[PDB]
Design a protein around this ligand. Structure first.
Ligand SMILES: Nc1ncnc2c1ncn2[C@@H]1O[C@H](COP(=O)(O)OP(=O)(O)OP(=O)(O)O)[C@@H](O)[C@H]1O
Ligand SMILES: Nc1ncnc2c1ncn2[C@@H]1O[C@H](COP(=O)(O)OP(=O)(O)OP(=O)(O)O)[C@@H](O)[C@H]1O
Ligand SMILES: Nc1ncnc2c1ncn2[C@@H]1O[C@H](COP(=O)(O)OP(=O)(O)O)[C@@H](O)[C@H]1O
Lengths: 160, 466, 508, 466, 73, 73
């Protein structure tokens, strides 16, 4: 729930902190530390602390303690400054923002999320989406092809 | 002092002048704004936490600001709540702030410090004295009579009229009583300690009264610290003896500091940056100090209004929360009268019919009707002139101008501040002279014969001899 | 890394165990032309000056954690967001010293046009406090204001506190231009704080004020339109820097102030631009500070105050601080918090009427509205005992003559308000550059008080009687100057004034 | 409008409204006047950064608009701040608001290209004597002593107009004194430019004046930015040997654009609907038109007050920032005279006092006392009758009517528009003829033959030759 | 309009009131006196217009009659 | 109530509401207790709502209101 405060944690840790081989520590530390307090015990019991050493050291060093310098420094600075109260977009913002150098994801053809490996425009979407293999799945792929002509002809010709 | 130990409030992290925030542990907060001894830059300064909070960082209230101190200086506090002086031992020396030395002599007072809040009696224990007191003039001693125990609120500050009413009222009221008092004094001028304090401190007048000093060069917390010193000496001296009068003045520091200090502490405003607790402080501070069963407290209030500010909370709160609601209009002082006081604003409770009499009823009815008709006949006698006039314009103008211009006179201190002499009038000539000058008997005098006249001796001798 | 800080975000989020921010320096977070947040400064003092980029004493507002609001002197819009500051030692280091009189002094220090070399005692505090209680006695001494009624009626001594206000476009800044030439020396080094001047005011005021009189004992520090917070709103508070070298030493101290309310708009940035609270025309309680240790410190010292403030130097003398502050009223605009607090914090109040000040008359003082603090206390024997009834002429003549166009006030009794009423009230008025001293009050109050030069004196008789009697009596007798040496009101004043005035005025 | 050197900067972020929040460089921000020429749409829309911020998104404000831009417009870095084109060669065509033209081509005479932000007030090398000026008229120079290079205010209604001041001042002041008199304009109409400009073809002033008007079809920042053209273009001629003389239009564009733009940006300012930048712009811009050693900088202070608003900054800034203010009513032009400026309330402080000489003091005292003492003999005496007309009524009425109707000498405005001559009135004829022959001497000039005469020099031969 | 709406008299058909359900609830009058102590007839706010306009009675006084010399106010 | 015009020219009913606006220092709280001899001596179940009082208001109002005919009514 950072929104505007989510660009600094995802953009500032994928450039200066990427030289120390921290590509796997951010996913396990952010996913484990952010997902470990998603129940009804660590969030209400750790978010209502008085100091930052008890919530940061207990919440970041008592539930597995699978962190190092980035986990203790990021958990202490984020918990003491006010950023560890939610942290729900750390995995999506850190993974999507840190993995922007080789991001290859397409869209959907009125069916299901295929997520093709197309890094550029019309890369692998034509061969992967037109070279069956798979042509129509069970998620209303072939049945949704008549929505354009049926909705366009019926909606555009419904006025008379 | 007497443990006054431990405390340990930590260092100041967010020092924003008077509203500091020293974070510490969980047990580092004052009890209802207790005393403290924080060692900032000078010495052990007090820091009463007016608003408690968690973590130790509370909204403290001190006298001076946080100028010169750093954001890491460790300080401390105190365990006692109130530890000042409250007694009749410090009479010849002025009490500084709480009860230290302000003048040349040192003030000590009583060692047994009581509460820092005034407490009056209940509804069946308040001995309200109904004794009418007369002044040394004619209109002030014959118009309305204030009773003992109650404090007459006088609106209007300095810059137009305050020394004439406070000097003649304080000198005539303090000299024409023959008793004990406990008046203090704060918020005066810079050179008032060598002129005003020299006469009362050198003329054997403050021998049985706990006086105090204080100019207008104090801070925000130092000028508003008169509640503990005034309530402690007034509540302790008013109940430990028989009688203890007072004469409070300079209400500008309490209204400006109390009404302006609430917006700088995090709270919301009220009326153009005013305090939201004016009824509790004005009603509790103005109603919790009256005449009790242990002793009468005939105090004297003086509201300081800025440029005749009669539309704020001082006029509405002081006009109903106190005894009389006097003021200082510019029409009396701008015309060159010998009174310079608004006598047509309000009066006392002994000016009706049963407790008054034929003199006060006939003088109040004739003076009110003649003054209202003559003062209200300007729409037909000012624009049109003397064309459509008759007996009402000459009789109302002569009776209202002669009674209003002859009802003012000096009162010792009011005599040396102008130029005319001072003569003490009586109640028989002033109360009996209204049925002759405003009827047709003593209406043969002119405008020069009624100027600076007492009652009937100065008007009859000056009008018949000159 | 919650906030975007690039260096501090990655360094603080990746290595929070090493902060190292106790040097009381660092840099700044942003710079919005004045409102700059000094980053760090954990051990720095709150309110202390610090030299940042350039030549400006940047002082912090408060010590709220490490986000202190620094205010640099001048415009900081051309610099980028990240100015490196230095250490914050201590503030209040203005040029204090009474020995810098004569040279040009500005609001920034001792460098102005064109003499930028003023030797002072040392850079110390400028915002002085008030005096004590028993050690604050007013010294009664005589002085010359500029006219006979001003110096004989309201004689303000050294160390008084009165309020003066002038009419707009009539004479609120000049009027009496013979004060420096007629008063010569004002005790010690003089001062005059102003806000709002240019080349015509400094050149005409410096050339006209310096060409007639002695300008080697006056250190006026005025300001133009390009003034900041320390040069416009802080002009009346920093004017008491050299006073400690004059008032707190044994002698007296002269000071003045012009256009005090005009700089009040400069405080609007502390109520509007700082997102604070407003009151009267968007202004907070900072003006109330002027009633604390600023304008309320104009009081004379006593005998015991000269031995403690000077660390043993006088031991018997009494100091004085004659700081008469004036203001330019907008056609009688004095009904707010500044007029009530400024007029109520002192002990004197004087107002100038705009009826005779713009019609061509020399008498710009109002009748009955001037209520000074001294008046007859600091006057001599020829101004308080013989000339003590100066209000009866203006009050009796104005009140008796302004009766809605009356016929005649008892005929003969109207002679003092119609016939010979203009020879003592309208004729005794200082015009453009008119000097006055003890000869005007002693000669005009010791000879024209009975019927020698006040009965038959009107227009031709009033001008010829005063010119022939003053020229023949002043040029024929030599003992009259002795009346300017002592008090007066004795047999020599009545015999010499009556015989010299009657014999010298009987053959006009 | 800045010199771009590099063309880098970065992208943008938000673009809602006129707030240009583009993220240019990180730690390489520019100055205040150094605008970033961003490529928004098709044109290079520059935005002046009023307040720089960290990160890249600075508080910038553009003049016109972006003409449809996206959320990530590319910007460009600059080097020289405020690099516009001006100089002393602008007297030839109409100018724009950014140093270009509005009439023909040539960018209003392309010459130099320095900084657009000129210096306000300065001393040292500047002229501190403040000498007086002389326009060469009997009802402008003899009645009001204007200073050389001052901001004289203007009041009144119609009567004179822009053709009389521009045509009469574009030939007499241009030939009597070396200098180029330019003009300006902010907040005009769209049709007046198609008519008033035609007046330039009737007096030959287009080749000696730079018309810099912004009309009113643009916004506040695009039409109120005409201060750099006048100060940047007028400084090249006044500091070289000539004397610049600008002319403003009104104060509605600067007051409405400054108060609305400065108060509608989310920040508090002054009261009574005003902004806090009025003292800096009015005091810094009003003191910049002063005399120097290389030429006097004069400017026609044609500010418009808000219907005589004494509580706002129009009466205080206009009456306290300018010098003399002449008023022109309909009474002087309704009777059929040449000059519409009346002699009442149209003088400076050094024009009627004792700070000039016997000519200005005797002419100002005699003309003012004769006009004020003679204005009531023809208006207040008309309701009764002319039976009580002695020598004062005939001499004051004949001298006041003949001097008032004959003192309006015609300048060079009607010499190339109507056909009447007159050349220019001298100070010796108007100062040595209106104080002796216009009171009670040489009563041979009538009312028809005395009209259209140059001061008192041409009126002597008209009494005997016509 | 909620707490100040108890200024109406009940009838004899009200079986509730106090005792249910015959007597002790017939002619039950409930008078109310809204004598507000204003500042010389100061009535130009939301409480004065809403309270004075939402009720049925209206009365005012003046200080000139009681302060001039008469007994009535 | 207690006057001649309050029972004929301005009479109120049992179970109605009438708003009043007394002037300052004239007939605000003094006219509603001083000129009320019929309402306090006739015997009616009234209820007063006093907000903001002290020793003089409770002593003068209790002694003057209890020393007439109401007291315990
Ligand atoms: N009482 C007076 N009678 C006649 N002339 C006067 C009087 N007082 C001042 N003057 C004239 O005023 C001139 C000085 O004006 P000054 O420069 O003080 O105006 P100002 O204070 O700048 O006006 P403003 O306050 O409107 O800016 C002098 O030349 C003097 O002749
Ligand atoms: N019925 C009446 N007729 C004439 N005069 C009256 C009457 N009732 C009271 N007064 C006058 O009122 C005066 C007392 O006023 P009081 O102090 O009670 O006003 P108050 O209750 O303080 O006003 P407020 O309620 O507005 O504060 C008495 O002097 C008396 O003469
Ligand atoms: N009875 C009176 N007659 C004439 N003048 C008076 C009278 N009382 C006061 N004054 C004038 O009022 C002025 C009050 O001055 P000061 O004490 O400084 O202000 P304040 O009274 O507001 O404190 C005095 O200068 C005095 O001349």
């Amino acid at each position: 729930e950072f929104i505007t405060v989510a660009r600094p944690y995802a953009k500032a840790a994928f450039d200066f902190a990427v030289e120390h081989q921290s590509v796997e520590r951010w996913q396990d530390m952010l996913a484990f530390a952010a997902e470990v307090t998603k129940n009804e015990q660590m969030a209400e019991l750790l978010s209502g602390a008085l100091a930052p050493e008890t919530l940061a050291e207990s919440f970041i060093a008592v539930a597995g303690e699978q962190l190092d310098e980035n986990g203790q420094n990021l958990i202490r600075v984020m918990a003491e400054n006010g950023r560890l109260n939610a942290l729900p977009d750390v995995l999506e913002q850190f993974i999507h923002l840190r993995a922007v150098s080789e991001a290859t994801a397409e869209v959907d053809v009125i069916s299901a999320a295929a997520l093709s490996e197309q890094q550029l425009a019309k890369i692998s979407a034509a061969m992967e989406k037109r070279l069956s293999r798979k042509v129509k799945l069970n998620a209303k792929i072939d049945k949704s092809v008549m929505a354009g002509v049926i909705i366009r002809a019926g909606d555009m010709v419904i006025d008379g | 002092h007497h443990h006054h130990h431990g405390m340990a409030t930590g260092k100041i992290v967010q020092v924003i002048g008077a509203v500091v925030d020293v974070e510490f542990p969980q047990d580092a907060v004052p009890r209802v704004y207790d005393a403290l001894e924080v060692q900032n830059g000078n010495e052990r300064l007090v820091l009463e936490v007016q608003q408690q909070l968690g973590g130790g960082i509370v909204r403290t209230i001190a006298m001076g600001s946080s100028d010169g101190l750093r954001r890491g200086l460790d300080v401390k506090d105190l365990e006692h709540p109130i530890e000042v002086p409250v007694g009749k031992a410090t009479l010849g020396r002025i009490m500084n702030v709480l009860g230290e030395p302000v003048d040349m002599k040192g003030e000590i007072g009583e060692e047994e410090r009581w509460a820092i809040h005034r407490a009056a009696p209940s509804y069946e224990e308040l001995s309200n004295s109904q004794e009418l007191l007369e002044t040394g003039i004619k209109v002030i001693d014959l118009m309305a009579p204030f009773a003992k125990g109650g404090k007459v609120g006088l609106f209007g500050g300095a810059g137009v009229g305050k020394t004439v009413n406070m000097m003649e009222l304080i000198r005539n009221i303090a000299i024409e009583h023959s008793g004990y008092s406990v008046f203090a004094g704060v918020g005066e001028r810079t050179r008032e300690g060598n002129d005003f304090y020299h006469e009362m401190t050198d003329s054997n007048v403050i021998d049985k009264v706990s006086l105090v000093y204080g100019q207008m060069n104090e801070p925000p917390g130092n000028r508003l610290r008169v509640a503990l010193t005034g309530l402690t000496m007034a509540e302790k001296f008013r109940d430990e003896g028989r009688d203890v009068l007072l004469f409070v003045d300079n209400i500008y520091r309490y209204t400006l500091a109390g009404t302006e200090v609430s917006a700088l502490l995090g709270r919301m405003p009220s009326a153009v940056g005013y305090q939201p607790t004016l009824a509790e402080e004005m009603g509790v501070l103005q109603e919790r100090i009256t005449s009790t069963k242990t002793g009468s407290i005939t105090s004297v209030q003086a509201v300081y209004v800025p440029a005749d500010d009669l539309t704020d909370p001082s006029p509405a709160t002081t006009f109903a929360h106190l005894d009389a609601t006097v003021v200082l209009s510019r029409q009396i002082a701008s015309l060159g009268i010998y009174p310079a006081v608004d006598p047509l604003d309000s009066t006392s409770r002994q000016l009706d019919p049963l407790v008054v009499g034929q003199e006060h009823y006939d003088t109040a009815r004739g003076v009110q009707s003649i003054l209202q008709r003559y003062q209200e006949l300007k729409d037909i006698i000012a624009i049109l002139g003397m064309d459509e006039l008759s007996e009402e314009d000459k009789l109302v103008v002569a009776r209202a101008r002669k009674i209003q211009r002859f009802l003012s006179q000096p009162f010792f201190v009011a005599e040396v501040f102008t130029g005319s002499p001072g003569k003490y009038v009586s109640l028989k000539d002033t109360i009996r002279g209204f049925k002759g000058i405003m009827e047709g008997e003593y209406d043969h005098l002119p405008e020069q014969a009624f100027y600076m006249v007492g009652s009937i001796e100065e008007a009859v001798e000056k009008a018949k001899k000159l | 890394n919650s906030t975007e800080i690039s260096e501090l975000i990655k360094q603080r989020i990746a290595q929070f165990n090493v902060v190292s921010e106790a040097h009381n320096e660092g840099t700044i977070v942003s710079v919005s032309d004045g409102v700059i947040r000094i980053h760090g400064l954990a051990d720095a003092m709150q309110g202390e000056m610090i030299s940042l980029p350039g030549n400006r004493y940047a002082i912090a507002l408060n010590l709220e954690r490490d986000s202190v609001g620094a205010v640099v002197m001048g415009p900081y819009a051309d610099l980028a967001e990240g100015m490196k500051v230095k250490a914050t030692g201590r503030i209040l280091e203005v040029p204090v010293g009474r020995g810098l009189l004569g040279r040009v002094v500005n609001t920034l220090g001792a460098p102005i046009d064109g003499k930028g070399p003023l030797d002072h005692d040392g850079f110390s505090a400028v915002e002085a406090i008030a005096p004590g209680v028993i050690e604050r006695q007013s010294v009664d001494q005589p002085v010359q204001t500029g006219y006979k009624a001003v110096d004989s009626m309201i004689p303000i001594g050294r160390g008084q506190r009165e309020l003066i206000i002038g009419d707009r476009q009539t004479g609120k800044t000049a009027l009496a231009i013979d004060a420096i030439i007629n008063q010569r020396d004002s005790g010690i080094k003089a001062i005059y704080v102003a806000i709002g001047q240019k080349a015509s005011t400094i050149s005409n005021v410096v050339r006209k004020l310096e060409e007639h009189g002695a300008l080697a004992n006056t250190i006026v520090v005025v300001a133009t339109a390009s003034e900041s917070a320390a040069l416009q709103y802080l002009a009346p508070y920093a004017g008491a820097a050299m006073g400690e070298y004059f008032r707190d030493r044994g002698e007296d101290a002269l000071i003045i102030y012009d256009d005090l309310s005009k700089q009040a708009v400069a405080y609007r940035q502390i109520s509007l631009l700082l997102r604070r609270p407003p009151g009267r025309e968007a202004f907070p309680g900072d003006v109330f500070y002027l009633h604390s240790r600023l304008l309320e410190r104009a009081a004379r010292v006593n005998a015991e105050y000269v031995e403690a403030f000077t660390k043993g130097e006088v031991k018997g003398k009494t100091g004085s601080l004659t700081a008469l502050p004036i203001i330019e009223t907008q056609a009688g605009d004095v009904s707010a918090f500044v007029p009530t607090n400024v007029i109520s914090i002192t002990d004197g109040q004087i107002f100038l009427e705009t009826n005779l000040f713009n019609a061509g008359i020399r008498p710009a003082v109002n009748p009955g509205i001037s209520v000074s603090r001294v008046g007859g206390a600091a006057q001599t024997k020829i101004m308080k005992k013989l000339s003590g009834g100066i209000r009866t002429a203006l009050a009796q003549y104005r009140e008796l003559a302004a009766f809605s166009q009356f016929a005649s006030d008892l005929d003969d009794a109207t002679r003092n308000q119609l016939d010979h009423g203009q020879k003592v009230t309208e004729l005794l008025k200082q015009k453009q550059y008119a000097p006055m001293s003890v000869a005007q009050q002693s000669l005009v109050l010791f000879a024209a008080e009975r019927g020698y030069l006040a009965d038959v004196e009107l227009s031709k008789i009033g001008s010829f009687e005063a010119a022939l009697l003053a020229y023949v009596d002043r040029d024929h007798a030599p003992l009259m100057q002795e009346i300017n040496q002592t008090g007066g009101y004795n047999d020599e004043i009545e015999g010499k004034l009556k015989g010299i005035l009657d014999s010298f005025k009987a053959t006009q």
